[model samples]
Target: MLKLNLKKSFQKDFDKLLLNGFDDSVLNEVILTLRKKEPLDPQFQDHALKGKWKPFRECHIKPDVLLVYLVKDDELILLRLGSHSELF
Candidate 1:
């Protein structure tokens, strides 16, 4: 099984998604895609965060939804989950 860490803020936002009618069926799709040495998604893009955040990246869950994360030592660290505006 894969291992990972979720930021407190990210978890907080994720919980909101759960309660806000967000369907988690995409987890399997996203997790596997991002678990690679280099993840690929049609909408994937550098989040281009300002100030000392070179390790992280971002991609869409759908249109307005976004997942922000980092790949470190073979583990995926989900830094944030929400609309890109809220994640950044």
Candidate 2:
């Protein structure tokens, strides 16, 4: 399985998500799929971002929440964790 690293800002973003009434399951499901290297299934809605976050991909977590990550050989660096607008 690939390593999942959560930085400071990402942790802050995730913390805010929980306070906003979202369940951990939303993020947990994504993490599980990533660990298993599951196919980029349509549900993930994975796609690349732009500008400073360019080259990184954003995946879905329900309709409002989102995650930004970059593929680094054997590690999946989770850079941002927030809502759709906040992440983009």
Candidate 3:
């Protein structure tokens, strides 16, 4: 498994998600797939970032729910989680 690094902002996002009634499993399943260094299923809409966000990548967990993250060497750093409107 890759080294896990959850950003503070990511934790804040998680808290907001939970408060909004989302189940933890909704995020955990995706995290498990990422930690194993395997490609996410196409339905997740995984893709790279660009421009100011070039160093990271993103995937959609729900229709509008996005996860921003990065992988460096053996590390998996989770950056943020939010709806597109909330993030951009």
Candidate 4:
């Protein structure tokens, strides 16, 4: 399993989502799954990003909830969290 590191922006987004009634439990589950370096289910639509975001990857936790992350130096760095409009 990889070590977990949350970016400041990601923590902010997570708090905002919580205020808006997002289910944090599911998000935590996904985070754990990633930490273990296990493959996410196809339904999560996990994939590498492109353009300026090529170094990172993202996945859908829900229809509207997105999680951005990176694997570097053997750590799972949580980079961002939010909807597509707010993130991209």
For model 4, give the 10-residue run with minimal summed lDDT.
Answer: 26-35
CA lDDT, every model vs. true structure: 0.64, 0.70, 0.74, 0.74
- Residue-level lDDT of model 4, residues 1-88, one tens digit each, is 6677899878877777767766776667655766566855667877788788887888886666688877788776788887766565
Per-residue accuracy of model 2 over 1-88 as CA lDDT, tens digit each:
6677886767766766667765776777665765576744566778777677777888775576677777788877877777666644
Tens digits of lDDT, candidate 1, 1-88: 3467789767866766666665566554555555554455545654645557566677685566677777677676788777645455
Worst 10 residues of 3 by lDDT: 31-40
Q: Arrange candidates by lDDT, descending.
A: 4, 3, 2, 1
TM value for model 4:
0.64
The alpha-carbon deviation from the true structure for residue 85 of candidate 1, after best TM-score superposition, in angstroms, is 5.2
Cα RMSD for candidates in order: 4.6, 3.3, 3.6, 3.6
Candidate 2 least-lDDT 10 residues: 33-42
In Å, residue 42's CA in model 1 sits off its true spot by 5.6
- Among all windows of ten consecutive residues in candidate 1, which has the lowest summed lDDT? 34-43
Clashes of each: 0, 0, 0, 0
Best lDDT among the predictions, by candidate number: 4
Per-residue lDDT, model 4, residue 69, is 78
